[PDB]
Ligand binder design. Structure first.
Ligand SMILES: COc1ccc(N2CCN(c3cccc(C)c3)CC2)nn1
Ligand SMILES: COc1ccc(N2CCN(c3cccc(C)c3)CC2)nn1
Lengths: 19, 178, 253, 283, 178, 253, 283, 19, 19
């Protein structure tokens, strides 16, 4: 389960990723 | 009779008169005497019933004995018939006691509402069934002159129930111990 | 045709008149399968020498008779071989055939209701939580009731018929495998019954799986000399008997 | 399946065909019920029937809609005490699992000899305020099979459930409800029994010999409080995925004691549902 | 004996009489002496048990020493046998003490219910196992005349448990400090 | 290798030392064939529950011991199941396995001759035409002789060994199926024996087909405490038991 | 997989084949247990077995259903004070993580030498009302590994958790429950140890040397209140994704002290579960 | 919506089916 | 329903499997 930005804005999202 | 077994037999008697009547019960399958019956006991677990029904009678008479009863189903509409002619007019079955022994009477389904209520209701009144003598009970010498007939009721493939509900026929005016 | 012939051991029974025969729950008695099994030892299966036609003690049919029962795993606690193998083994399993004979004449009138019953937990005659006693639900060939008298000190069952001894309006009893003996057509009653129990093989001593009842419904009525006695005789045949869990030997009681 | 299952038309009953008259030999209405079998006669046989296409399902007439319904089988009660907390055999309940201890439902089953099924549960704590404020009252319902430490009193060490099941409910959160297999041991639950403990003329005999699925102990955590309370955590039980073998006559007389079949009032010359008639002639 | 080690050995003695008996224990794997055993200790973590079981015995006797015991498994049904004949009648194994030293006795699974309860229950009674002399314990000159036998119990691939529950064999009538 | 393992019922026997095993007349015991048969009924064949390893009463080996015998059809007239089936049926047929155990130490010296014998018609101890009595050739687990004392009023056999009890120089006895128990190598003796008799199934009561004898040849000699008792234990296993001619039940005697 | 996993038939036990008699040389029943090995004898070997197709799974006999069950391992308590709020070492708890401080569960593990697993947690605050109204009482459970500021008293600065974990629960909201890896450091959790701190004849020695996964400090936010309270936030622990190496004998004697193995009552001449028999001859 | 045995065990599931 | 590790970390997941 993931990438389901339930919210529109980007500022709202999980902790970013890593690379 | 009731607290005993006899409460199950129906003795077919003398009858000085002729064309006399035996018994009657009403069809509303939740009505003592019916109720308590494996069926009744059950039906009383649902709010609505439907279909045909089957009444069977057996002669616990003798072998050399003979008789002919007339059983009838008087659909809902009027009063349980006072006389045979009046009752013979509707649904019935003449029963010839003989080498066989069991006559099964069917109770067609006559109703307005596809369905009937299991609970006492003037509307959903299923009617009456009664039994009378067609001829007599003749017995040759030195045979008893009263004898019994057992009666039963099983369903028809017609049959079906619905709307489960908690029973009537059992009040646990307890509790229950240990 | 009504005539029937049955052969079980070294024994055979005939009946020039009958009301079919009945197979309990429409299943024919047979031997246990390595699927439903549980035990691990090889069961001893006395064939013939065991599952044969044993006849019990006879009884009188009275105008005062009330009814009499026999409990099967128990009725043959003495019947040779079967009833020894019972006592020598822990696990016992078997099905039966019940031939109920009761004749009189075509000038007689009477009706007997015969029925077998899986787990027939009887009720005590006395109010409370005291269950019927062992020794009294373990009568033997002789059976129980008749319409008899007894100590009320004994944790004694209900001699009460109409309630089914279990307190279920007799008459709904027709739900158990059965048939009648209407002296005007019938002569006997034949019940055949497989092994019913949540376990593959039970204790032939502690547990009686089948219970048989015979109850006069319409009272015997002749016009003859009461010199004319009309017995009731029961005959039984373990079928597909199987035993296991061999050892010392229990004890009679 | 859907439609048939959503429309509930799985088990449908046949229809009543049309008949004509019969002035013929074979009489279907005549059979000898002594054979112990059941007649097979129908409307179409006895009368001059018509033609009715049916549409009644025997869905609700399935051992699963007959059995699969939640029923009070026990009412655990705790009249708390703050005076003596703990103490022996206090402020924590322990009832013996298995019905009987409750009617209605008991009667239902008993309709069959054997039986088997996964049991779904549901609790219904009801906190009666006997004080001017209850607040937060945690609860611990912990099941316990046989050979297991049953708490002597509240805070034993058995309430650690290191390997047991304890469900927790705190005032507010919805009603706990869990399930449970077919437990027992062999094949199915003994709806009766005609066996005993042993040859001991003092041995036990009844459907209490084959069913001892341990006990369940309650207990109200949260500890000591000011304003008193009394709890009554109801119990309901539902049978899901049920099975049935061999049926039997219903129970007309009001039961007695737990386990056992006994019938036998304190005089009540005994009593059954049958009603009395003046005469057979009129109904 | 019990708080010590001996509590583990079983000395095979003299026996003036013949055909005399050694010991007995009951099979119900949650019953001291059994219980405490790696198995028992465990089983007491589950509500139900099943399958066969294995009892092994070893001769801590001498080399020049000799004996022959008869071990037996008396299934559930009756009382632990008072006499050998009575017990020999069921499941058993004659054990010839010799260059080998260990005889392993299997306890078949005999039961009605596929499964047995781990908790003391009159119903789920697994039975008894006992040991007796077949011959004697003969020892040539200047060898002791009593000697010990150790006994053990491991499972069978038959074996299996279920319904986890908290143990019996351990009451923490503590607490536990720091 | 000498070690041996034998499994017959729910029973097994072991022996960490042995002198082979012997099959009587090189024939292995089995069930009766519809060719040599004669009877007409289906024989009951208890398997396992019957043909298992029964052990008798033990005995003492004395420096004064003279010898002791057991008659097989008879030694198990009490051994559960087999020994009931014996009494319930007319015809009985069965073969056996004889495990003779007798240990002591490697510091002991002794020799036992074990032998089975088809139709062992014993002789009476008294001159005349009076044959041994029933009741005395029907000892039971317990066996006979030892070197015992008894009524000479009884039509009593010959307690006489060297003549074979039948009056044939013991030593020619080696003709019957046998083996010894030389305490210096041996531990047991194992005899296995089929059913020998001019009839397909005999009377398990009137006729004992096999007769077994054990005779101290070289007297037991230790240098130990006579506190050291060296028993002799016999174990037996009906094999391929088959019965038939079911009925009431004989009586014990 | 499903069926096998839903039906729970993953680890099934073999069946018991059929046997016949054996009048043969090799005696399987004879082995010498001194080899330290275990016999391999079976039903089929010893008797004349039949044929039983089995159907028992050894699923529930897995280190995960043996271990994977929540158990009280600690009962944090706070008898609040309103008189002095804050003050040093008050109204905020701090217990040393690791079992022992609780039986049942402790005994379970100890069944093995080493071990390893992710730990699932669950809190169970229980607010006892000692007042005529509690209302809203926030809570802060903040974990703290080693070398970390442990709050001197309630409102330190360590309750800012700028880089620590603090779970918050407010009366109403369900029971907090989080997880946690395998922490430790090397490979697995030392279920015992036969090492010491050092050569100091005063060094530590036991399974308290290899396990110091810091402490966890509680604390009831909300500040000062009128009507008093007392809290008891229970603790349960479950082992998910567990592993096991090398087993060992269970613990029959009631423990002593935390860490350590010590057995040794205050006289109780010592005591174990073994029962006494009159005679070996009758059981 | 169906056959989503959100729980592992089988004992936990809806009322069975009919056939 | 399954394998929906709603959470990122592995330490957070159901009771493992069996094999
Ligand atoms: C005789 O058949 C039965 C009848 C009832 C029963 N119950 C169902 C309810 N159950 C249960 C219900 C709630 C809580 C706990 C621990 C157990 C106990 C067993 N078990 N077997
Ligand atoms: C010896 O093995 C163990 C045994 C227990 C343990 N615990 C598990 C619980 N845990 C825990 C539980 C709840 C809250 C917090 C902060 C930590 C601490 C470590 N760690 N290692």
């Amino acid at each position: 389960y993931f990438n389901i930005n339930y919210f529109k804005d980007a500022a709202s999202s999980g902790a970013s990723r890593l690379d | 009779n009731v607290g005993n077994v006899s409460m199950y037999t129906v003795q077919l008697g003398n009858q000085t008169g002729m064309a006399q009547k035996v018994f009657s019960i009403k069809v509303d399958i939740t009505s003592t005497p019916l109720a308590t019956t494996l069926i009744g006991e059950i039906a009383s677990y649902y709010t609505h019933w439907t279909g045909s029904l089957r009444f069977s009678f057996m002669f616990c008479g003798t072998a050399n004995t003979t008789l002919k009863l007339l059983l009838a189903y008087t659909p809902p509409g009027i009063d349980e018939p006072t006389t045979r002619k009046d009752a013979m007019l509707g649904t019935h079955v003449v029963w010839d006691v003989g080498l066989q022994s069991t006559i099964s009477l069917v109770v067609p389904w006559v109703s307005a509402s596809h369905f009937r209520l299991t609970a006492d209701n003037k509307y959903s009144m299923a009617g009456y069934i009664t039994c009378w003598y067609q001829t007599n009970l003749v017995v040759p010498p030195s045979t008893p002159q009263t004898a019994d007939m057992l009666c039963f009721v099983s369903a028809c493939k017609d049959f079906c129930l619905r709307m489960a509900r908690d029973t009537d026929l059992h009040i646990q005016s307890g509790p229950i111990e240990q | 045709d009504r005539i029937m012939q049955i052969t079980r051991g070294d024994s055979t029974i005939s009946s020039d008149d009958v009301a079919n025969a009945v197979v309990g729950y429409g299943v024919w008695p047979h031997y246990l399968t390595p699927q439903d099994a549980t035990a691990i030892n090889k069961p001893t299966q006395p064939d013939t020498s065991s599952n044969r036609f044993y006849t019990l003690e006879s009884k009188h049919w009275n105008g005062s008779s009330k009814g009499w029962w026999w409990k099967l795993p128990d009725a043959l606690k003495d019947m040779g071989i079967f009833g020894e193998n019972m006592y020598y083994h822990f696990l016992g399993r078997s099905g039966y055939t019940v031939h109920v004979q009761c004749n009189a004449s075509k000038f007689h009138q009477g009706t007997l209701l015969v029925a077998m019953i899986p787990e027939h937990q009887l009720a005590s005659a006395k109010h409370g939580s005291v269950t019927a006693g062992y020794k009294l639900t373990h009568p033997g060939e002789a059976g129980r009731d008749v319409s008899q008298e007894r100590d009320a000190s004994l944790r004694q069952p209900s001699d009460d018929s109409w309630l089914n001894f279990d307190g279920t309006l007799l008459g709904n009893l027709l739900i158990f495998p059965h048939q009648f003996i209407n002296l005007r057509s019938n002569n006997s009653a034949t019940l055949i019954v497989p092994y019913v129990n949540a376990v593959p093989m039970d204790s032939m001593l502690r547990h009686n799986n089948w219970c048989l009842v015979i109850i006069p419904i319409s009272p015997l009525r002749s016009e003859t000399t009461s010199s004319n006695i009309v017995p009731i005789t029961v005959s039984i045949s373990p079928m597909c008997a199987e035993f296991s869990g061999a050892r010392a030997k229990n004890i009679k009681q | 399946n859907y439609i048939d299952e959503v429309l509930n038309e799985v088990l449908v009953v046949p229809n009543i065909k049309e008949s004509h008259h019969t002035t013929s030999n074979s009489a279907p209405l005549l059979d000898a019920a002594e054979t112990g079998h059941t007649s097979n006669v129908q409307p179409e046989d006895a009368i001059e029937t018509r033609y009715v296409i049916t549409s009644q399902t025997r869905d609700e007439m399935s051992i699963e809609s007959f059995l699969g319904r939640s029923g009070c089988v026990h009412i655990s009660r705790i009249k708390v005490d703050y005076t003596d907390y703990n103490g022996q055999d206090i402020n924590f309940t322990k009832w013996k699992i298995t019905l009987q201890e409750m009617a209605q439902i008991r009667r239902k089953f008993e309709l069959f000899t054997y039986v088997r099924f996964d049991s779904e549960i549901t609790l219904v704590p009801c906190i009666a305020g006997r004080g001017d404020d209850i607040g937060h009252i945690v609860m611990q319902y912990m099941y316990v099979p046989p050979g297991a430490p049953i708490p002597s009193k509240r805070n034993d060490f058995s309430w650690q459930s290191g390997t047991n099941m304890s469900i927790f409910w705190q005032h507010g959160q919805p009603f706990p409800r869990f399930s449970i297999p077919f437990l027992s041991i062999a094949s199915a639950y003994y709806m009766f029994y005609d066996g005993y403990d042993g040859d001991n003329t003092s041995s036990k005999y009844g459907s209490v010999v084959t069913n001892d699925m341990g006990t369940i102990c309650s207990r109200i955590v949260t500890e000591k409080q000011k304003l008193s309370v009394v709890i009554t955590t109801h119990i309901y039980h539902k049978a899901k995925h049920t099975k049935a073998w061999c049926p039997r006559p219903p129970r007309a007389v009001p039961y007695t004691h737990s386990h056992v079949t006994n019938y036998m009032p304190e005089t009540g010359d005994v009593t059954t549902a049958i009603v009395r008639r003046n005469t057979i002639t009129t109904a």
